[PDB]
Ligand binder design. Sequence first.
Ligand SMILES: [Mg+2]
Ligand SMILES: [Sr+2]
Length: 119
Amino acid sequence: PVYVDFDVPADLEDDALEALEVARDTGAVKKGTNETTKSIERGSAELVFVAEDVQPEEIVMHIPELADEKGVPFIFVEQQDDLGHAAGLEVGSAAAAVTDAGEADADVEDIADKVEELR
RNA sequence: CGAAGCCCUCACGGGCAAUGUGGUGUCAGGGCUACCUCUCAUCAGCCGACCGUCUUCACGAAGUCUCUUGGAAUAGAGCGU
Ligand SMILES: [Mg+2]
Ligand SMILES: [Sr+2]
């Protein structure tokens, strides 16, 4: 909520999580806020995901400002458990990162372009 | 590094854990990269006392002889261990 500056539509979120499911079975993904943060700093992150139901908000707070100065695109997911299942975990995830997509590079590029049109 | 982990249960199965279980590491700084050599340090775990001290216990030598006094010798004198 405090780190959220734009609302992402349910349709765009469906596209995003589907692209993440095929990113783990082909390319490579980073699961968890610590690994997502290191990906943005190292530059290896292509697209970063962030949950909106994170309590406390401090865990994720830095991602929207850190990604802006590193050129890495970010998208908001409504639920924590949906992002965790999409990353391939039994538990939830506050943040996920796509470190070089696989056979979804065209979809990821479009998601990154649809988010910029939504500010 | 990133699920490689932990708890419950005979098992099955369940719970925990990416908001990080677990590995690494902790100022002789450490990590990472490139190498030299090596370990007996440390940490985890198995085994597991001696001696001493405190207390309790077993065993454990040699007269119940003479006389006098006395209610009674454990006294005096004498002999003996
Ligand atoms: Mg350790
Ligand atoms: Sr959770």
